[PDB]
RNA sequence: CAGCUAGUUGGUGGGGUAAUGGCCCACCAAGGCGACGACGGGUAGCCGGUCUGAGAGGAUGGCCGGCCACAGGGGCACUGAGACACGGGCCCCACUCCUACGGGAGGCAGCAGUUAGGAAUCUUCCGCAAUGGGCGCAAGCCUGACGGAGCGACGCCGCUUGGAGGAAGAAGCCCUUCGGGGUGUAAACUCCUGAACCCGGGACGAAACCCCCGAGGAGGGGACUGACGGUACCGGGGUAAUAGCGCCGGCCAACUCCGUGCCAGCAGCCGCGGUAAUACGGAGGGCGCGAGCGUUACCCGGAUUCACUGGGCGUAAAGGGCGUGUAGGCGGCCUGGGGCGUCCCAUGUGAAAGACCACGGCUCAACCGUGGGGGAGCGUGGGAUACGCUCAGGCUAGACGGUGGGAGAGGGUGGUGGAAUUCCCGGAGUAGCGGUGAAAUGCGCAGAUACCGGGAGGAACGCCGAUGGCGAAGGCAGCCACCUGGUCCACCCGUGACGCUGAGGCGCGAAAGCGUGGGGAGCAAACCGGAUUAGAUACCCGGGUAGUCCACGCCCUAAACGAUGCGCGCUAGGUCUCUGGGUCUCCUGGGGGCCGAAGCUAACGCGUUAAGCGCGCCGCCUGGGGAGUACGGCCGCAAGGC
RNA sequence: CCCGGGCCUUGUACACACCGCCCGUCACGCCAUGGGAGCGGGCUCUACCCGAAGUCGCCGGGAGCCUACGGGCAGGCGCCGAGGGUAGGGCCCGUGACUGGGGCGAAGUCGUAACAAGGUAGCUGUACCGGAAGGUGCGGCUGGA
RNA sequence: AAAAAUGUAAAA
RNA sequence: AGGAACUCUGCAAGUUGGCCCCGUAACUUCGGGAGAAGGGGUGCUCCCUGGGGUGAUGAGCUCCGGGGAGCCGCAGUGAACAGGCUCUGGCGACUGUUUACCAAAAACACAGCUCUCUGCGAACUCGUAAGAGGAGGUAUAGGGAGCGACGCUUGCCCGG
């Protein structure tokens, strides 16, 4: 443009909006579990994936993701939000943490514990 | 009626220069001789003299280059290789001092309209005092 | 969110306060504010500072420091130098508790501590010993301010889990061309040190108020007190003494084996997995980092992806459809005063904490003390005048005007000419015409087609006519006249910077469309029929309405296309065309088209008719889809448009 | 001309490359959203009615107390006044039978409109019409020859 | 100036 | 005391009622919706005061009004005259007309739309006729038919 124009009209501000609606972006959000079921991968992968429905304390209601082998949620479980989508699951937009709350870690995993919620074993 | 008149003016040089002229003409002006004083007190142009276009005071230009180049396209070398405007009609551009710029690290000029006469990038600096930023030449 | 305002704006007089003031009252006058964004809505305490960043900028205001505001919600005034008063008071509201039912108590957004909510945030500690505050002649009293401890890898910093040696190289584990390779000096083991732990000693922080001579002062000499603490620190005695997390396809540093078989599962981006995966899981090994590692979240960065620095708009997102002009923005050559912008000096200022540099303190650091530096901006005084600005005088190069000529489908009105189509009348004449790729529907023995004469009506204008001209765009063609805009060249005659651009606004704006009235030849959505086709709401054929035309009014869109906004300046030229000037195998001004110097460009391609070099102004773009939709607002009879 | 092949040229939205690609209705599932008889909820504006405490103003009289008799205090009325109440508008949020279109999907159905004269050049404003893409009309643009 | 429709879904 | 529980139905009755001022939505053909709604005032006494008519420019007379102080009752248009309101659907646009004497409507009439006849000695109507109306009008006129303001719009079928 001109001079006169930044004088007048101006840069318009960038601003961008959160990729995850989890209130305060809060690190986590707690929530009840209700619905616990697998859905179908998209378009390059098939590999029914373990997901939930949480119906947040924060009045909201989500899905999230299992990661691990296997789990033990059912329908009235309560559980944290880890928040990261899924770009495998269309709407999956928050993962669901590991070894808190009702909702248990993972059996037999040695790598990368940390992720997966397991507190470190004994080998002696 | 255009509006600055150092603007086409400062483009009278660098469009000549670029098809290699002797020299061009240009409306007689006070703040032109300025230009073209310093212009040629640093060395850019071979020097000026006020003529005339049918009862029209101009300004003979007489451009400076370099020696012929060997190689690919004879590119004899450019004396002014760069002049822009700085402070536009638009923009007034107004600097301080100890703000002066430093065209090229030195190798180039910054030709501005000082509040107690016109200076050099350098001479400016040394008499210490600022002014509008006319251009830079290198 | 586009208009807002009755104490509203101002005035006179008065009330009230420490004091000015619609702060408040009575009376009077209509003013006050706003696209430089009033009014509305949303959000939020502000700064010093902090975070990031090459800087400019962006983000931010936790701790400490300064100002502000509140003390359950909400109002009030009393006391006072000061309050609308956290730990005061009165009243209403919600809530809690007592109650002899008449009444009464109470406020942690003070330290600590509950409970709720949440992802998540500490002991109901010690002392007035130090510092500061209140009262007091003093002694001394109180002090959850503070000094200090306690819990939490929450952060930054210092340290420990050891050091030297030690096999051509244990054991196990992994790999293997079965030779060997790897873990790996790693360990085992030898030797030295010695955190932890033990014993003894053991602070600074403290001096002063208090006593004495002098004069109850100045000066000088004497005396009391330590929460932390029996802590840190000093000396001695002293045991090898916790290691974890992420990654290993590319980005990105780290490769192999088994298992699995589009499963399980990974995923930040691209992607991997469907029998041999360095990408899922385990292992061996390696890479990084270390009392940490890693995830999620949020901020700056990369992002020159809102571009001042520092973008761009022919086809990639983007020139407004075109014109007129309001604000605003910009300003030709010379001379003069002013000195507003701006430039320089001096000065007040910019407090402390911080950041930076320097020295120093705590064993170092973190932390901290001390000193030095210049700081943007603003206040005052002085100075300069170059360009911007401003008043003043002069010029003619921009723009305008005069005189004189020219070209043109520029526009509007009235009139008018031939050709041809259809129709009707009359003449003559007979079996077919028409139509397609083919054919049919259709038209004709009631006399068609073809041809001849007369008439009626509507619409469009052949040849001239083009690589043409004209206008702002849309757009404009037979012919004559009227009225009328724009444009060009010559004479350099007049004016004397009068200019460029243009948010909003005003006007124009193809075609289709709507409204009342008029006209209707041909053509022609829709619609009817024939044929093709699986189907054929279509391509072709036959018939046919609105519309196409006139008037007046509205609609306002388009591939409105050069897909290229407007204006002034500079930058080879060759070629032909429209038009104008001139003693003219040629020169000069305006317009149209091709090819190309330099140059720009992602390429194509542009290139004096720029997409070149440069200034001024508006318009506009910031991934695709969603969607030119939805809502709101405005315009319209509607369709629909902005 | 049919099938197959070669060199040059033109076009292209095709690139294990015309068995390529590709459009729209309809059908099933999913996600978000617009309108919707309404309902519910917050904030806000105006008019009026009631009106605590309290300052201020008046009275303090047929009534109380105080008094250096001039006055004071109590008390009463009034103004304003928190909030409460009634009626009516503005904005925002949630919700709602049904409905509109949109996005999404290894597979369906119906055609083939688009890219090659895509086998009627295509695109386009507007109009009309049709299961659907789309056809046709009036004009316009090449991004057609 | 050339009557004639259509090929779903797994690797460079 | 309650407040539509009555009943086919708030039928009837009751509520509201006049003026003054405040204030007033959806929607809309911008005219309206409007008296929308909802709400305040209304008497008497004293005092100040603005304007018009007549008339001399004022005295009296007379019309409409402004401000302040106060008095009495349960009640101030103190009696009589004197809308109850709102939301939503159907039909008909609307004012109008009708079954004198059980129906006032959604019926008819209407403006405006369309079709059709009629060229004047008009068509049509009454009359046997003369004649008259039409009309001392002339296709922007007249007769007949249907539809019924306005907006959007009106599809395919001549075989009978
Ligand atoms: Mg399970
Ligand atoms: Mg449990
Ligand atoms: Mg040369
Ligand atoms: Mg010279
Ligand atoms: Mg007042
Ligand atoms: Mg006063
Ligand atoms: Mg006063
Ligand atoms: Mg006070
Ligand atoms: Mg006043
Ligand atoms: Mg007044
Ligand atoms: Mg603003
Ligand atoms: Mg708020
Ligand atoms: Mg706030
Ligand atoms: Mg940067
Ligand atoms: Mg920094
Ligand atoms: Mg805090
Ligand atoms: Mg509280
Ligand atoms: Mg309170
Ligand atoms: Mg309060
Ligand atoms: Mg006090
Ligand atoms: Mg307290
Ligand atoms: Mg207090
Ligand atoms: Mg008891
Ligand atoms: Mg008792
Ligand atoms: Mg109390
Ligand atoms: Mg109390
Ligand atoms: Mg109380
Ligand atoms: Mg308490
Ligand atoms: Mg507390
Ligand atoms: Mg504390
Ligand atoms: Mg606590
Ligand atoms: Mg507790
Ligand atoms: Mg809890
Ligand atoms: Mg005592
Ligand atoms: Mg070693
Ligand atoms: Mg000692
Ligand atoms: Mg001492
Ligand atoms: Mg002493
Ligand atoms: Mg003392
Ligand atoms: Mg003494
Ligand atoms: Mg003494
Ligand atoms: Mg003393
Ligand atoms: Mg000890
Ligand atoms: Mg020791
Ligand atoms: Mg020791
Ligand atoms: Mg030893
Ligand atoms: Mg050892
Ligand atoms: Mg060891
Ligand atoms: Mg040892
Ligand atoms: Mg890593
Ligand atoms: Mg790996
Ligand atoms: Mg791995
Ligand atoms: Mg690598
Ligand atoms: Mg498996
Ligand atoms: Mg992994
Ligand atoms: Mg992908
Ligand atoms: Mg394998
Ligand atoms: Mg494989
Ligand atoms: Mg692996
Ligand atoms: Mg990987
Ligand atoms: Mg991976
Ligand atoms: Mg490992
Ligand atoms: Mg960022
Ligand atoms: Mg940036
Ligand atoms: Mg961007
Ligand atoms: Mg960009
Ligand atoms: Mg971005
Ligand atoms: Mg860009
Ligand atoms: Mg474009
Ligand atoms: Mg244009
Ligand atoms: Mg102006
Ligand atoms: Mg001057
Ligand atoms: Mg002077
Ligand atoms: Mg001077
Ligand atoms: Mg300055
Ligand atoms: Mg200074
Ligand atoms: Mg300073
Ligand atoms: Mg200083
Ligand atoms: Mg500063
Ligand atoms: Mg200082
Ligand atoms: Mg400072
Ligand atoms: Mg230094
Ligand atoms: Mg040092
Ligand atoms: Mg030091
Ligand atoms: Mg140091
Ligand atoms: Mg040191
Ligand atoms: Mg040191
Ligand atoms: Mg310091
Ligand atoms: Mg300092
Ligand atoms: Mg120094
Ligand atoms: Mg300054
Ligand atoms: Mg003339
Ligand atoms: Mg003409
Ligand atoms: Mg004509
Ligand atoms: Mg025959
Ligand atoms: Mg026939
Ligand atoms: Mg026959
Ligand atoms: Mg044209
Ligand atoms: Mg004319
Ligand atoms: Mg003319
Ligand atoms: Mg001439
Ligand atoms: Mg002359
Ligand atoms: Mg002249
Ligand atoms: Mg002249
Ligand atoms: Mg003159
Ligand atoms: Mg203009
Ligand atoms: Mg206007
Ligand atoms: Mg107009
Ligand atoms: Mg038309
Ligand atoms: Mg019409
Ligand atoms: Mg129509
Ligand atoms: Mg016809
Ligand atoms: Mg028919
Ligand atoms: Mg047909
Ligand atoms: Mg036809
Ligand atoms: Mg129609
Ligand atoms: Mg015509
Ligand atoms: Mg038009
Ligand atoms: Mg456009
Ligand atoms: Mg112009
Ligand atoms: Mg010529
Ligand atoms: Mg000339
Ligand atoms: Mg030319
Ligand atoms: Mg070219
Ligand atoms: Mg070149
Ligand atoms: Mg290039
Ligand atoms: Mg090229
Ligand atoms: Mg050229
Ligand atoms: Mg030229
Ligand atoms: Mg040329
Ligand atoms: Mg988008
Ligand atoms: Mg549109
Ligand atoms: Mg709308
Ligand atoms: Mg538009
Ligand atoms: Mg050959
Ligand atoms: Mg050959
Ligand atoms: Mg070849
Ligand atoms: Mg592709
Ligand atoms: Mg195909
Ligand atoms: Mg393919
Ligand atoms: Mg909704
Ligand atoms: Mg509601
Ligand atoms: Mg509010
Ligand atoms: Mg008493
Ligand atoms: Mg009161
Ligand atoms: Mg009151
Ligand atoms: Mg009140
Ligand atoms: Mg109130
Ligand atoms: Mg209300
Ligand atoms: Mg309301
Ligand atoms: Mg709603
Ligand atoms: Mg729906
Ligand atoms: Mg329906
Ligand atoms: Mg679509
Ligand atoms: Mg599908
Ligand atoms: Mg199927
Ligand atoms: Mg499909
Ligand atoms: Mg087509
Ligand atoms: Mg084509
Ligand atoms: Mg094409
Ligand atoms: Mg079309
Ligand atoms: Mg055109
Ligand atoms: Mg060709
Ligand atoms: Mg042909
Ligand atoms: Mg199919
Ligand atoms: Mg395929
Ligand atoms: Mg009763
Ligand atoms: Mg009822
Ligand atoms: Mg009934
Ligand atoms: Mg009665
Ligand atoms: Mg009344
Ligand atoms: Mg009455
Ligand atoms: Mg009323
Ligand atoms: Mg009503
Ligand atoms: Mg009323
Ligand atoms: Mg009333
Ligand atoms: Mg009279
Ligand atoms: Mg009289
Ligand atoms: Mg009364
Ligand atoms: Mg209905
Ligand atoms: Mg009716
Ligand atoms: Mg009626
Ligand atoms: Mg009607
Ligand atoms: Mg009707
Ligand atoms: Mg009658
Ligand atoms: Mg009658
Ligand atoms: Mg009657
Ligand atoms: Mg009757
Ligand atoms: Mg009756
Ligand atoms: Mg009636
Ligand atoms: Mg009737
Ligand atoms: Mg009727
Ligand atoms: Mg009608
Ligand atoms: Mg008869
Ligand atoms: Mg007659
Ligand atoms: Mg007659
Ligand atoms: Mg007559
Ligand atoms: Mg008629
Ligand atoms: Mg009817
Ligand atoms: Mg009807
Ligand atoms: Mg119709
Ligand atoms: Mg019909
Ligand atoms: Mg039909
Ligand atoms: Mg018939
Ligand atoms: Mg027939």
């Given at each position: 443009?001109?001079?006169?124009?930044?004088?007048?009209?101006?840069?318009?501000?960038?601003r961008?909006?959160?990729?995850?609606?989890?209130?305060?972006?809060?690190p986590?959000?707690?929530?009840?579990?209700?619905?616990?079921?697998?859905?179908?991968?998209?378009?390059?992968?098939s590999?029914?994936?373990?997901?939930?429905?949480?119906?947040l304390?924060?009045?909201?209601?989500?899905?999230?993701?299992?990661?691990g082998?296997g789990?033990?949620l059912?329908?009235?479980?309560?559980v944290?939000?880890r928040?990261g989508?899924?770009?495998?699951?269309?709407?999956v937009?928050?993962?669901?943490?590991?070894g808190?709350?009702?909702?248990?870690?993972?059996?037999?995993r040695?790598?990368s514990?940390s992720?997966?919620?397991?507190k470190?074993?004994?080998?002696a | 009626?255009?509006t600055?008149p150092?603007?086409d003016?400062?483009?009278?040089?660098?469009?000549?220069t670029?098809?290699?002229?002797?020299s061009?003409?240009?409306?007689?002006?006070?703040?032109?001789?300025?230009?073209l004083?310093?212009?040629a007190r640093?060395?850019?142009?071979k020097?000026?003299?006020?003529?005339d276009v049918?009862?029209?005071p101009?300004?003979?230009?007489?451009?400076?280059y370099?020696?012929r180049?060997?190689?690919?396209?004879?590119?004899?070398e450019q004396v002014?290789?760069?002049?822009?405007?700085?402070?536009?009609?638009?923009?007034?551009?107004y600097?301080?001092?100890?703000?002066?710029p430093?065209?090229?690290?030195?190798?180039?000029?910054?030709?501005?309209?000082?509040?107690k006469?016109?200076?050099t990038?350098?001479?400016?600096?040394?008499?210490?005092v600022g002014?509008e930023?006319?251009?830079?030449?290198?």
């Open positions: 443009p001109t001079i006169n124009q930044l004088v007048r009209k101006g840069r318009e501000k960038v961008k909006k959160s990729k995850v609606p989890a209130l305060k972006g809060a986590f959000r707690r929530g009840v579990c209700t619905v616990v079921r697998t859905v179908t991968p998209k378009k390059p992968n590999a029914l994936r373990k997901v939930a429905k949480v119906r304390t924060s009045g909201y209601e989500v899905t999230a993701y299992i990661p082998e789990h033990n059912q329908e009235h479980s309560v944290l939000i928040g989508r899924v770009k495998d699951l269309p709407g937009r928050y993962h669901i943490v590991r808190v709350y009702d909702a248990a870690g993972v059996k037999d040695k790598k514990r992720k997966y919620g397991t470190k074993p004994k080998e | 009626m255009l600055d150092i603007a003016m400062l483009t009278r040089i660098r469009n000549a670029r098809v290699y002229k002797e061009t003409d240009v409306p007689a002006s006070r703040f032109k001789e300025e230009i004083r310093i212009l640093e060395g850019f142009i020097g000026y003299e006020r003529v049918d009862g029209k101009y300004l003979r230009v007489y451009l400076k370099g020696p180049r060997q190689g690919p396209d004879p590119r004899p002014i290789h760069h002049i822009r405007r700085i402070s536009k009609p638009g923009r007034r551009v600097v301080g001092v100890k703000e002066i430093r065209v090229r690290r030195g190798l180039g000029i910054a030709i501005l309209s000082t509040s006469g016109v200076l990038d350098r001479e400016a600096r040394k008499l210490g002014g930023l006319i251009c830079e030449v290198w």
